[PDB]
């Protein structure tokens, strides 16, 4: 019914070589069933946790998915989301400036 | 503290 908005970002300002947390925040979606993976160089990261399902005034759901990571010059991080509203998974690359 | 459940719809 309603497609997810996606933001991918770090908990702290990124510095290469310094440990941090990679967040994927999905919101504005319905129904609540959703597939969210964090990727490192295109591969699913195994140890990913998420917040308890909650929702906004308009009944749309939101979740935060997160894992520890270390920004580097060479590694690419991304969030991959699938949902009934999406024809195919949506991939949003992490950009340290956003 | 949560409320007691309401009647069903």
């Amino acid at each position: 019914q309603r497609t997810p908005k996606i933001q991918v970002y770090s908990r702290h300002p990124a510095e290469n070589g310094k440990s941090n947390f990679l967040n994927c925040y999905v919101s504005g979606f319905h129904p609540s069933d959703i597939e969210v993976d964090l990727l490192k160089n295109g591969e699913r990261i195994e140890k990913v946790e998420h917040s308890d399902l909650s929702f906004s005034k308009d009944w749309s759901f939101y979740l935060l998915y997160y894992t520890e990571f270390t920004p580097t010059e060479k590694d690419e991080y991304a969030c991959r989301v699938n949902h009934v509203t999406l024809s195919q998974p949506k991939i949003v690359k992490w950009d340290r400036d956003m | 503290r949560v409320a007691s459940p309401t009647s069903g719809v």
């Binding site: 019914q1 309603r2 908005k5 933001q7 970002y9 908990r11 300002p13 947390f21 967040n23 925040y25 919101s27 319905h30 129904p31 609540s32 069933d33 917040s51 308890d52 399902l53 909650s54 929702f55 009944w59 749309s60 759901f61 935060l64 997160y66 400036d97 956003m98 | 503290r1 949560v2 409320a3 007691s4 459940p5 309401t6 009647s7 069903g8 719809v9």
Partner: protein
């Protein structure tokens, strides 16, 4: 400042096998403090903030009993609603319920709410008088008459103006070191050249609490919205929040542009300029 306590309940039916997924969370302001997840091992209401852990076994037993009862009420409701809307047993459907109370800076009752949704749309909601019902369609109207006959609004009103506010005040005191503390946004500006001719200035607000914040751009002292982008406020993951606002400007003209930050944790709004 003002404060609120809110509880959020979601039930999702599972036609293929088994019972609905049920998730309940409680918040004081923007801080989650309890949860129940039918998929979790405890089958209990669980603490999610240090200041609630001190509550005794009587508390946890009662919260668990009540939340498990909520889950069963929602399970039955999913069946009832399927019937009301003449729907198949084959599809998954969702019930959501949210209620809570707001208090002012003096911790006195300000307002109460209790609303219910089916498949993501308004179904029935308690009006601000805490006596009347907004029913969105004729199924909801059936429910409204049922709820009138069962004195539902009376009970909700009593909870919202009583227990809800009384326990909110308890939590605010017990968790004062964090719940009554504001964390002002840490702010800075970044610059991202797009060409020889122009650049993006991005105004950041980080690690703030509560989540409410306003970021605005001005050029030469007048609000600017052309060529701006403002992202939705997002959780940092450590209990605080983040937000940014950006504007594209002609290079060399950066000093015309000011970012303005308003937040409860700031005595006076902040003004930032590119350095």
């Amino acid at each position: 400042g003002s404060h609120s306590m809110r509880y959020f309940f979601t039930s999702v039916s599972r036609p293929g096998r088994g019972e609905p997924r049920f998730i309940a969370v409680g918040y004081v302001d923007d801080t989650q403090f309890v949860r129940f997840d039918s998929d979790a091992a405890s089958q209990r209401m669980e603490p999610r903030a240090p200041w609630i852990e001190q509550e005794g076994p009587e508390y946890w037993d009662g919260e668990t009993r009540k939340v498990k009862a909520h889950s069963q009420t929602h399970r039955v409701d999913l069946g009832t609603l399927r019937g009301y809307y003449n729907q198949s047993e084959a599809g998954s459907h969702t019930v959501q319920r949210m209620y809570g109370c707001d208090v002012g800076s003096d911790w006195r009752f300000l307002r109460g709410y209790h609303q219910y949704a089916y498949d993501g749309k308004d179904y029935i909601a308690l009006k601000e008088d805490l006596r009347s019902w907004t029913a969105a369609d004729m199924a909801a109207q059936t429910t409204k008459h049922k709820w009138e006959a069962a004195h539902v609004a009376e009970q909700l009103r009593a909870y919202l103006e009583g227990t809800c506010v009384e326990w909110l005040r308890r939590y605010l005191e017990n968790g004062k070191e964090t719940l009554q503390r504001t964390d002002a946004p840490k702010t800075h500006m970044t610059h991202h050249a797009v060409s020889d001719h122009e650049a993006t200035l991005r105004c950041w607000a980080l690690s703030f609490y509560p989540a409410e914040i306003t970021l605005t751009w001005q050029r030469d002292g007048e609000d600017q919205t052309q060529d701006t982008e403002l992202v939705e406020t997002r959780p940092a993951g450590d209990g605080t929040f983040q937000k940014w606002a950006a504007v594209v400007v002609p290079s060399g003209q950066e000093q015309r542009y000011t970012c303005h930050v308003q937040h409860e944790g700031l005595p006076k709004p902040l003004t930032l300029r590119w350095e």
